[PDB]
Design a protein around this nucleic acid. Sequence first.
RNA 1: GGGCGAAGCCAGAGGAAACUCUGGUGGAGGUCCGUAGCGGUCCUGACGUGCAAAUCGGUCGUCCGACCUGGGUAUAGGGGC
RNA 2: UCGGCCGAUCGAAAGGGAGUCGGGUUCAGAUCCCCGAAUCCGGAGUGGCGGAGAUGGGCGCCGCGAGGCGUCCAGUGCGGUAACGCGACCGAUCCCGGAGAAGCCGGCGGGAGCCCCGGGGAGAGUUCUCUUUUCUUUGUGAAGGGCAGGGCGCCCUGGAAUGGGUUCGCCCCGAGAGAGGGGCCCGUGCCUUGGAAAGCGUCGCGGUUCCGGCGGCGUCCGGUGAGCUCUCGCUGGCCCUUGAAAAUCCGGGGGAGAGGGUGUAAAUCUCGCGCCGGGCCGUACCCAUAUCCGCAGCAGGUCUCCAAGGUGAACAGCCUCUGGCAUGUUGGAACAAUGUAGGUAAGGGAAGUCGGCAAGCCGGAUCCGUAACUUCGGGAUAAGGAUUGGCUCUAAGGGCUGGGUCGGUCGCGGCCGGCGCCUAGCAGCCGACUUAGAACUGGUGCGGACCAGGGGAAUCCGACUGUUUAAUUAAAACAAAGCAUCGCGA
Lengths: 69, 91, 50, 62, 101
Amino acid sequence: PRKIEEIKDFLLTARRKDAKSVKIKKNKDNVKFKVRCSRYLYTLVITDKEKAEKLKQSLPPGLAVKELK
Amino acid sequence: AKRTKKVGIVGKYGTRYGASLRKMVKKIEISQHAKYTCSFCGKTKMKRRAVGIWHCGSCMKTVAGGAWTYNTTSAVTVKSAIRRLKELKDQ
Amino acid sequence: SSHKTFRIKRFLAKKQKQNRPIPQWIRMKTGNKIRYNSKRRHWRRTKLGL
Amino acid sequence: KNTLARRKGRHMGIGKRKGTANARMPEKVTWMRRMRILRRLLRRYRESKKIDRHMYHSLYLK
Amino acid sequence: QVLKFTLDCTHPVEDGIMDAANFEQFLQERIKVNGKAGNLGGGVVTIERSKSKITVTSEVPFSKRYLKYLTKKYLKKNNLRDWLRVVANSKESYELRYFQI
RNA sequence: GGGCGAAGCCAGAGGAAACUCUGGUGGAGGUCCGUAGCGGUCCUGACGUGCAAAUCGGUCGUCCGACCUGGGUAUAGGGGC
RNA sequence: UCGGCCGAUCGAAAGGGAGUCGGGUUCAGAUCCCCGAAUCCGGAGUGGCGGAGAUGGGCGCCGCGAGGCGUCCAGUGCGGUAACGCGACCGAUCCCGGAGAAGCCGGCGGGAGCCCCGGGGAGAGUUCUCUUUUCUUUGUGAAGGGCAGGGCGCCCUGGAAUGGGUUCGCCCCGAGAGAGGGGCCCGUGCCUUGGAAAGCGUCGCGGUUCCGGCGGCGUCCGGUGAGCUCUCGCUGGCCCUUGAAAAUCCGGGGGAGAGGGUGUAAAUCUCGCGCCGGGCCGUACCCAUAUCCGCAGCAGGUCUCCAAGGUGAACAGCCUCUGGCAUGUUGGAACAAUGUAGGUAAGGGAAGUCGGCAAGCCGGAUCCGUAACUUCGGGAUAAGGAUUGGCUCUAAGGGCUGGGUCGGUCGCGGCCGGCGCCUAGCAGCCGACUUAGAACUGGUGCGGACCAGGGGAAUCCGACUGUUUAAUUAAAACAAAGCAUCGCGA
Ligand SMILES: [Mg+2]
Ligand SMILES: [Mg+2]
Ligand SMILES: [Mg+2]
Ligand SMILES: [Mg+2]
Ligand SMILES: [Mg+2]
Ligand SMILES: [Mg+2]
Ligand SMILES: [Mg+2]
Ligand SMILES: [Mg+2]
Ligand SMILES: [Mg+2]
Ligand SMILES: [Mg+2]
Ligand SMILES: [Mg+2]
Ligand SMILES: [Mg+2]
Ligand SMILES: [Mg+2]
Ligand SMILES: [Mg+2]
Ligand SMILES: [Mg+2]
Ligand SMILES: [Mg+2]
Ligand SMILES: [Mg+2]
Ligand SMILES: [Mg+2]
Ligand SMILES: [Mg+2]
Ligand SMILES: [Mg+2]
Ligand SMILES: [Mg+2]
Ligand SMILES: [Mg+2]
Ligand SMILES: [Mg+2]
Ligand SMILES: [Mg+2]
Ligand SMILES: [Mg+2]
Ligand SMILES: [Mg+2]
Ligand SMILES: [Mg+2]
Ligand SMILES: [Mg+2]
Ligand SMILES: [Zn+2]
């Protein structure tokens, strides 16, 4: 697994051709966006919730947006 | 305190092998395990590695020497003789 | 053992297959003269050749 | 319960000892603790300027 | 710094096999504060009842499992141990109910 | 798992020196007591149509070494070892 | 033109040898199946995408400046004094080196797992009285990133005797100590992605005759150590003993060559990502007082890994927990002789017997105290003597922090300073075991079971340790070091 640090790197990671799906896991303290690429599972950790909600609608279309809750 | 009167290093052999054989091996074992002053670096670190092989820990210089002493009295006279014959050979 | 060669495993496979009772309809054949499989082998009584 | 008694000193005695004094509390371990405690004290005294290099080195050998 | 644990005696009191008044009357002398039973350790640990709910509020480090230990001690004294059972229904709360056949 | 405590080293004391004495440290050895292991002393014990075509009980020897042991190799009959 | 594996080939399921882990699942298989996270090797000719190479200066001009045009010249990366670092970082034949690749033993130190202690939960046990009690349980794989921690015979400054640093031991230093500042390696520890969604513990609700069902809550905080077991490291000792090889992989030296004419460029790339593939054979189970060998479900034999609590020196013996079992190919009833195994015995104490055979005595630890003889090492636990319980205390043996003389002031707080003498060192907190001494006390009993040397005086033989007739002889026999002799210059 790989941990994506800032928001921008996650966007073009999710826009890759080998990105199979993105999973959103809502914990008590953070929201994790996990995109399943060919080699690695890229996880982006968002501390707050407004940025997590903003990222939810900005995801590329045609990609599975499975919610883990 | 001085722990033994006369056996010294061969106290490890106990009562075994005979007094004269222990006395004979005593002076060899002392020179075998002694640390000599290295003639290359000047440090007292030249110690026996194997039989006939003497190695210095500091300059990592390995010398071929005697079995129990760093050099034998045989080889020392030989080196002096070879030097004398070499300076006689040339002029 | 658990580690075995293919030739040994094939040998043991044949021994399993031929260690079975005769079929019941054999005894009804004309002039049978066979009562039971006399070449039955038990793993504990007699050991295999290898 | 018996461990708490042994802390206070019960069941130690002379008739409760089966091993040698060195097997119960090794002298080499006792010497290490003493050397480590005393060398640490001498070091802390040297870096707190209670003693100098030369008094430290005399006491270290002592 | 307030603990506020709770004991719920509802199923047995509605079946009349025990009363919460006596169980309250049992706790105040058995609770030990700093090892001393009686006087609730100088009244630091308080006790009160809602006729089914007995809540214990403390201002000192006080264990919830102590209430279960004390409650089980009451039930054995009153021969209720073979029918009732103290179960943690939530945090800061205990509740005693029947064995389910 | 314990015992003994070789050389090397530190401190103190006595000495003109040579050196000596005391207390520690150190941890050597085909070293000691003794497990596991390996072996097999005595009971001339048990058994002796046995549990066993050589086993069992207690007692024993050794247990850092010429130590114990698996597997792989080599040596074959007037030959091997 | 270059090209010696100078020799086929075979030889290890314990040596060498890249790279898979966590959860679930069966009646029986799983590191192989399913789920999820990785990873190694190989391939990509028509070149898969990026990134690197690699895209800057000079001069004429235009242009208010900035910036645009032409020409010329570079450009096989860059940083640090250094150790060395950064994401790549052209390069053949050839050469050099490394890794693979190294014994046994000792002593320390780091890390983990387990054990122990103090609390917080959840569930159980006891409750005749006591017991805030006793018991169970209380996760985070590989692979990445970061940080501890450990190690360095690595670098720079500097130059040390009144020598100093330093270990349990050692050991180190003008061939460069101490001190200050750096660099590298390992990082199995912690945090993080994996990750809680899983797993587990509890409490419930539905049913799909047999749900990876649904749901609530929890999965917490600390402290210890000559502890045990693995592992990593450091430093020693021993050897007339010096403790594999080869596949395989890598680095360096050298520079034959290749690449482009200033282009949105070339050769090239051990950098990031992407695409495809990994065939063959083994895999169940037993592994032993019943799956093997011994004619057998035979008290024999048969190579290893893991390893809890108490007592205790202890992997001893004895009791217990997890796990396992049914007493070893039968039961019942009696309790004769004789037996086998185990005890006790008044008085005497080897009178028994070939012979103290067998049994018994002694035994641990502490404090004393120890002879002849001797190869000076030993003898030696010589011999001999005293003590040993329980309970209540008293001393002694450690580690962490903080020691200010104060508003002269504002980042009831902070930068400098007039502002003071712990300097015979204090104050608080935490913490193991161990030793010594004392009182009291029991029907003198206390290493209370277990564990656990009888001793001395001599003679013979063999020096010792070692070995030996598997199945009647373990010896004084053999061996041994030491001594001596003999043959031999290929
Ligand atoms: Mg058989
Ligand atoms: Mg020995
Ligand atoms: Mg012995
Ligand atoms: Mg015999
Ligand atoms: Mg007999
Ligand atoms: Mg081969
Ligand atoms: Mg299985
Ligand atoms: Mg984790
Ligand atoms: Mg230095
Ligand atoms: Mg959960
Ligand atoms: Mg299997
Ligand atoms: Mg058997
Ligand atoms: Mg046979
Ligand atoms: Mg049987
Ligand atoms: Mg029986
Ligand atoms: Mg039976
Ligand atoms: Mg008698
Ligand atoms: Mg008598
Ligand atoms: Mg007689
Ligand atoms: Mg007679
Ligand atoms: Mg006897
Ligand atoms: Mg004697
Ligand atoms: Mg007493
Ligand atoms: Mg002999
Ligand atoms: Mg002799
Ligand atoms: Mg033999
Ligand atoms: Mg025999
Ligand atoms: Mg002689
Ligand atoms: Zn030298």
